[PDB]
Design a protein around this ligand. Structure first.
Ligand SMILES: [K+]
Ligand SMILES: [K+]
Ligand SMILES: [Mg+2]
Ligand SMILES: [Mg+2]
Ligand SMILES: [Mg+2]
Ligand SMILES: [Mg+2]
Ligand SMILES: [Mg+2]
Ligand SMILES: [Mg+2]
Ligand SMILES: [Mg+2]
Ligand SMILES: [Mg+2]
Ligand SMILES: [Mg+2]
Ligand SMILES: [Mg+2]
Ligand SMILES: [Mg+2]
Ligand SMILES: [Mg+2]
Ligand SMILES: [Mg+2]
Ligand SMILES: [Mg+2]
Lengths: 31, 131, 237, 88, 101, 128, 300
RNA sequence: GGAUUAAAACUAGAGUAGCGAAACGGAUUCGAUACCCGUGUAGUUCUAGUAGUAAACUAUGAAUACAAUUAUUUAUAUAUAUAUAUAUAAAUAAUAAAUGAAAAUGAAAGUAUUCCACCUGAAGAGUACGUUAGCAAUAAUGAAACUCAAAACAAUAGACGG
């Protein structure tokens, strides 16, 4: 796939990583 | 295995330039012959100026007596000789390179092989048949 | 490039035009081409002999044909790797033509470098007219040169007068020296005899060279002076 | 002959195994050892099919058993721990 | 001036044959263009058949293939075969480590 | 088409084939064995220069590190093969009857084969 | 057949040559065969080669290496100037003489073994004449020969004990002599370098026999006078003789006593003037060069 | 199934010059959580482990048989009038044929054969859930619903380019 199409997967991976960092943080405070 | 040692001995006394080299060759030669080894040749190379000022055991040097020693010994003995040379304050630099004997049993020193004399027999036969 | 089909089938494509009626009149070439068909196979052809030396191409020597030991002292009992590789390519590769005379020709001009300085004409007259009897070196129609020696050497080895090629070659070389010496004298004497009867010549070969060298040495003088003055200015910087 | 090949491989396997025991991080030569051991298995498996009597004689003399030859072997980490290849 | 730079005059050797063109400037330029160190082979030990690795204890010979600072010359300059260049470079590196070069 | 595709070797052909193949293997083993002995002979000729005792070591050190002795200083391309090539040529032609100090295995072979002795007597008998 | 005809064709007659057409080293003799075309053929660019020579070429003489190449051109140089050097030598009428007084190579003389007393000098020249031989092909002259010579051991182990047994029991000083002769005697039948590529005599520069006098209307010519040019204004360094350019050859000029004053005056342009020279002798060296000695005849 | 597996990361014990996430400062800027500069913690290093992921790419699985040329190296062998010449392989470059959507591939991306892996519109999604493994970060396995008539590749002519 071209760079243009790769960029869509890049955004999805970024948002998943951002959400998992956010979830981690919560667990630390709630723990 | 056949090994070729090249040692740069220190010239402390300008009056006796070839004194530590003789004492060192005897020490190394005795180790070889006392551990089932054979000393094939000892080619002195003379006093030469070092490419730079070198240091050893908190001392500096600008010249050294170069000498070559072709000897046959086991790998364990060869490492023992190298360990003693790396510790002796007299020795400034020492290298031991293996000389392959796979194809022929009698190989001359690299210095001689560089001059076309591949075996010690060629060197000896040029000192008897023509000298 | 692909093997073309339309150049050799003009007769068949034309015949379809005439049969249908698209072309009313038969072309003038039509009958001529029909009676003389073009060759249309365009195939690669194997070859089983070198025409120059008669060496056979495509023959494998079997182990049964090598019963005796080799130069190493070993017998051959099984085919080697080379014998087991297909050699079809050798059948199709144009054979390298070789000649024994080529070896002698190189030798002659290595021994006599100045024979190269004698101009040779490569333009042929008529190869089919050459009626030469190589019992003697001189021949009417061709110059005396290195080729005269080589052909004489071959005739000697062909007639079996000499066995070794070297001996035949040496014999021919001396015949060549004798003919070369008689010609060097005929030219020297002819010049001497003419001058003694009042012949005059404008420019000799030595004079021709001096004049040509002067023309070159004059241009060289100008440039040297010019370039020995630009240097002086450029170096002054 | 398969018996000779297996014996010649055995000598090299023994030497190579000794090397690995002193060079446990030399993975390049561990891979070579694995392949060589598997090659010996293949040659002996053919021998069992070709000449069963010689096969059993050969493996007995080499110190192996039928299981060592027939069973799939990968010389993996579990093998190095179950037979204490490196010792301790 | 009765003097010419050597670069502007050709000295014909003794025993050689010459043509009128040999006195021209074209000959001077042609000799410069086609001036290559082809006589090195006969004076180049490493292009004779010796193994360059046998000279690791002879810095004088090895110093002929390094620049003024000791940088090994590229094969494009030495003109050696791939094997001899490979062996020569090893010899020089070994010589440097021994303390001779 | 009627010709058989393969003709099996006759028992006699297989016998001659085995003779040649056994000979080939035996000749190579013999030639390698003789080459090794010839190298052992050329090593014996030079073993007088090798040191295995302290007495030899002291003599070698003195003879090499002496002011008279010359040392390989590698400062100039010294000037001067044939010598060693002449010993080879003579040992190839003469063989057992050679005058070279460094001889080949021919001499040792003639000794153990009763040739250097059966020729010495032959020459002496001729002189008689 | 076509193959037979091709071998005898005029193109086949020219020996293969790949020597550089542009050579800047020392030239002692011709290296390429001069090709000549007639004026009629030149008008049609026909030279008897594979392809037409470009019309720009106006000379009728050329030298070539390859009939055709991957660049779709002929490799040739439009020059034929070594022929004029040979003809100018002929005009100087100086026969080439041997400075060593050797037999004339162009005569079939009955020679004897006077020089064959150096059998060990030249029998070993085959293996010792290897100045420019490969390091391993020259080494193949050691095992290949050793086996050949070692195959004559039985023959020499019987001949020597049957013709010179005393030497075998007394000294090898004479045995070595019998060995050198044996191999040569068993090698003359063989063919080792049976063809010798060395230049034979003059190499074809001159086929003139010494002895003849040049008759002229003004009497017999006793001294040959030839115009020439002085190249250097200072004698060859380390040599007591200057250099002259006479008839396409560089000679060594010896002056009577003093050097004419035009030398200092002209300086580095001395080559711009023509002097008269006398050709004393002409010799031939083994490299194939001609050693021409001259004398600067000065108006007196 | 097994083994090995860049960088980052992690668990212990050392090391820590230089570099350098982060952090704290200096600038730039309309603003500058950046680009540039400073101080510089983890890390980068070694020893013993965990983990098995990369545009881990030639974006091209492995094996076998076969097909037209040239050039250039390399290797082996052969010959000699001793340094070339002649052979047979390998590699690389440019190609014929063939193939292909074409770009191109070129001894395969050709002509065939054998075996394995994998794919079936886009997005949702390599996500959710479950399970397995790991100290952990995570890795592997891996959907469906809803929505849409899209989505993608090569090439062509333009327009534009700090
Ligand atoms: K650090
Ligand atoms: K696969
Ligand atoms: Mg894809
Ligand atoms: Mg297998
Ligand atoms: Mg890396
Ligand atoms: Mg840590
Ligand atoms: Mg900040
Ligand atoms: Mg700010
Ligand atoms: Mg920073
Ligand atoms: Mg692991
Ligand atoms: Mg991941
Ligand atoms: Mg992946
Ligand atoms: Mg990579
Ligand atoms: Mg495989
Ligand atoms: Mg996952
Ligand atoms: Mg596109």
């Amino acid at each position: 796939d071209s760079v243009m199409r790769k960029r869509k997967k890049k955004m999805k991976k970024h948002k998943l990583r951002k959400r998992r960092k956010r979830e981690k943080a919560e667990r630390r405070k709630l723990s | 295995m056949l090994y070729e040692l090249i040692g740069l001995v220190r010239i402390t006394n300008s009056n006796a330039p070839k004194l530590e080299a003789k004492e060192l060759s005897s020490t190394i030669g005795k180790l070889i012959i006392q551990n089932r080894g054979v000393v094939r040749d000892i080619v002195p190379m003379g006093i030469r100026y070092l490419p730079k000022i070198m240091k050893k055991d908190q001392e500096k040097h600008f010249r050294a007596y170069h000498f070559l020693m072709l000897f046959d010994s086991s790998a364990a003995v060869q490492s023992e000789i190298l360990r003693t040379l790396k510790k002796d304050p007299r020795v400034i630099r020492s290298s031991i390179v293996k000389v392959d004997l796979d194809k022929q049993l009698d190989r001359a020193s690299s210095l001689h092989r560089s001059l076309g004399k591949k075996s010690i027999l060629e060197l000896v036969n040029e000192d008897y048949q023509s000298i | 490039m692909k093997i073309q089909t339309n150049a050799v089938n003009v007769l068949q494509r034309t015949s379809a035009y005439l049969k249908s009626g698209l072309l009313k009149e038969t072309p003038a070439w039509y009958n001529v081409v029909a009676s003389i068909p073009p060759s249309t196979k365009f195939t690669r052809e194997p070859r089983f002999k070198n025409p120059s030396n008669g060496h056979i191409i495509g023959k494998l020597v079997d182990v049964t044909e090598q019963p005796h030991a080799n130069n190493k002292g070993l017998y051959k009992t099984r085919p080697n790797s080379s014998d087991k590789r297909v050699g079809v390519k050798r059948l199709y590769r144009p054979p390298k033509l070789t000649y024994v005379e080529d070896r002698l020709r190189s030798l002659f001009y290595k021994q006599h470098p100045w024979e190269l300085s004698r101009p040779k004409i490569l333009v042929e007259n008529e190869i089919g007219d050459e009626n030469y009897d190589w019992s003697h070196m001189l021949q009417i129609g061709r110059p005396l040169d290195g080729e005269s020696v080589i052909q004489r050497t071959m005739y000697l080895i062909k007639t079996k007068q000499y066995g070794d090629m070297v001996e035949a070659y040496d014999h021919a070389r001396y015949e060549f020296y004798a003919l070369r010496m008689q010609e060097e004298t005929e030219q020297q004497v002819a010049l001497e005899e003419a001058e003694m009867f009042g012949s005059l010549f404008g420019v000799s070969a030595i004079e021709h060279g001096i004049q040509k060298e002067q023309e070159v040495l004059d241009v060289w003088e100008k440039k040297v002076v010019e370039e020995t003055e630009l240097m002086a200015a450029r170096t002054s910087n | 002959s398969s018996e000779v090949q297996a014996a010649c491989m055995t000598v090299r396997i023994q030497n190579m195994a000794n090397h690995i025991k002193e060079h446990r991080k030399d993975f390049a030569n561990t891979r070579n050892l694995r392949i060589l051991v598997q090659q010996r298995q293949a040659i002996l498996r053919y021998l069992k099919r070709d000449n069963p009597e010689k096969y059993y004689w050969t493996i007995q003399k080499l110190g192996l058993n039928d299981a060592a030859i027939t069973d799939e072997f990968n010389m993996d980490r579990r093998y190095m721990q179950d037979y204490e290849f490196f010792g301790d | 001036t009765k003097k010419i730079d050597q670069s502007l005059s050709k000295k014909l050797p003794k025993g050689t044959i010459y043509d009128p063109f040999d006195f021209s400037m074209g000959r001077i330029h042609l000799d410069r263009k086609y001036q290559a160190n082809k006589n090195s082979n006969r004076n180049d030990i490493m292009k004779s058949g010796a193994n360059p690795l046998e000279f690791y204890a002879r810095p004088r010979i090895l110093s002929r293939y390094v620049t003024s600072t000791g940088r090994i010359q590229h094969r494009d300059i030495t003109g050696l075969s791939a094997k001899n260049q490979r062996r020569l470079s090893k010899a020089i590196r070994r010589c440097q480590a021994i303390g001779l070069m | 088409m009627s010709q058989p595709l393969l003709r099996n070797r006759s028992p006699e052909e297989s016998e001659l084939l085995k003779l040649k193949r056994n000979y080939n293997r035996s000749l190579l083993n013999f030639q390698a064995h003789k080459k090794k002995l010839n190298e052992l002979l050329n090593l014996y000729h030079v073993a007088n220069e090798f040191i295995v005792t302290e007495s030899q070591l002291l003599k070698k050190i003195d003879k090499v590190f002496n002011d008279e002795t010359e040392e390989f200083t590698d400062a100039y391309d010294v000037t001067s093969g044939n010598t060693t090539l002449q010993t080879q040529i003579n040992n190839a032609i003469m063989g057992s009857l050679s005058n070279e100090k460094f001889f080949d295995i021919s001499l040792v072979d003639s000794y153990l084969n009763k040739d250097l002795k059966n020729i010495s007597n032959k020459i002496d008998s001729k002189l008689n | 057949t076509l193959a037979e005809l091709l071998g005898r064709s005029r193109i086949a007659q020219v020996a293969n040559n790949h020597k550089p057409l542009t050579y800047t080293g020392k030239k002692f003799h011709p290296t390429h065969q001069i090709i000549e075309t007639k004026p009629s053929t030149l008008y049609r660019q026909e030279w008897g080669l594979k392809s037409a020579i470009p019309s720009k070429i106006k000379s009728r003489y050329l030298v070539y290496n390859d009939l055709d190449t991957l660049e779709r051109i002929t490799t040739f140089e439009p020059r034929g100037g070594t022929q004029w050097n040979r003809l100018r030598f002929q005009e100087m009428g100086v026969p080439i003489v041997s400075n060593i007084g050797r037999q004339n190579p162009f005569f079939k003389y009955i020679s004897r073994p006077e020089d064959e007393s150096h059998a060990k000098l030249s029998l070993f020249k085959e293996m010792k004449g290897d100045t420019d031989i490969s390091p391993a092909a020259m080494k193949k002259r050691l095992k290949k020969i050793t086996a050949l010579i070692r195959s004559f051991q039985d023959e020499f182990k019987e001949w020597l004990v049957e013709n010179h047994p005393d030497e075998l029991k007394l000294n090898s000083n004479k045995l070595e002599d019998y060995v050198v002769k044996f191999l040569n005697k068993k090698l003359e039948t063989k063919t080792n370098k049976k063809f010798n590529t060395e230049i034979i005599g003059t190499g074809g520069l001159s086929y003139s026999l010494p002895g003849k006098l040049k008759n002229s209307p003004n009497g017999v010519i006793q001294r040959t006078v030839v115009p020439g040019r002085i190249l250097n204004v200072v004698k060859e360094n380390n040599d007591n003789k200057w250099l002259a350019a006479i008839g396409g050859f560089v000679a060594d000029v010896v002056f009577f006593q003093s050097p004419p004053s035009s030398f200092n005056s002209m300086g580095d342009f001395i080559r711009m003037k023509t002097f008269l020279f006398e050709i004393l002798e002409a010799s031939m060296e083994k490299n194939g060069s001609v050693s021409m000695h001259a004398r600067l005849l000065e108006p007196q």
